[PDB]
Each structure stands twice: as structure tokens, then as C-alpha cells.
Amino acid sequence: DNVILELTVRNHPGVMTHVCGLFARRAFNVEGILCLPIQDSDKSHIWLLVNDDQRLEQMISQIDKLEDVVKVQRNQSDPTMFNKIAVFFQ
Amino acid sequence: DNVILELTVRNHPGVMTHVCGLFARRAFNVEGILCLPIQDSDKSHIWLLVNDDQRLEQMISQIDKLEDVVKVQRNQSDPTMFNKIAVFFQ
Ligand SMILES: CC(C)[C@H](N)C(=O)O
């Protein structure tokens, strides 16, 4: 099964590298990404599609403690959002 | 004005970190990101929306030199794709 991670982050350089770096060093593959800026703010929203995994719980607290991560939520977006997007942009 | 870069990359851990690492190491902000797997293959597409910039041509050649980037295209994508995605997920 897959699950969506939703992040509110600051829209500054380097922020996306720190987030995926946590997945990279654990060899945890990210299957889908969507990052959009939030209008009239210095923040962006990030949706990550990842396989559910016993390690994701340890990984959520380390994403939250990153300085430029405002908020992180899991399983609050139905995973098929990326199959919906995939219908328009292959 | 902006530009969309379409990377074709291998769908393995750490790939997204190497790619955003190069924008981070040049204090270059990425405004929009979309990443989807390519069906029935070990590859994925990464679409990056970035502000047009004089460093960008050189940045594009270094993206292509990454082991795991099979190709990099530029403005070969629907230019409004991020405004279309934003209309349903914001
Ligand atoms: C293609 C990319 C998102 C890769 N799966 C990664 O985790 O870095």
C-alpha cells in the first residue's frame, strides 16, 4: 500500500533537499512528489507518495523537527491524487 | 517569467536529493515540483518550475551530467501545467 505525506514548508532554497535527504540516507524511495507554493505567503505545500512502512513513524518525527518544515501530516489525502494527475501529465 | 524543466530520471532512492542539491548549492529556489513514475519502467519524470535565470543554462548541463538523469528538457511541457494542478489541489 501507499500513503501520502503532506508537508507545509518554507519556500526557500535548500528546503526540498533536506526533506528528501532523510529518505535518501535510509534508501526509502519516494514514488510521487507534488510541491506547490501557497499564494500570498512564504510557504509551499508538499505532497509525498511513499510506500507505508514500519520506518515511516520514526521518519515523521525527524521531518517535523526540521527547521523549515512547518507541519507534517500523514494519510489525510487519498493516495489516488497522483493517479488523477497522471491522467493529464504522463 | 518562468521555465519548466522536464527531467527523465531513474526511479531510485536519492535521485531527488541530488537534483535539488544542485539548486540548493546555488541558492536557487525551485517554485514548483511534480514527480510521477513512468508506467512499466524503472524511470520517472520530474517537472521543475523555476524562474528564468542566467545561471540556468549552466545548471541544466550539470543536471544532465548526473549519473541518474537520463535526459533534461526545457519548455517541452505544457507551460500552464502547474496552474492547472494548483486549481484542484489548492
Ligand atoms: C524519482 C525520485 C523521486 C526518486 N524516487 C527519489 O526518491 O529520489
Ligand SMILES: CC(C)[C@H](N)C(=O)O
Ligand atoms: C519548497 C521547495 C520546493 C523550496 N522552494 C526549494 O527550492 O528547495
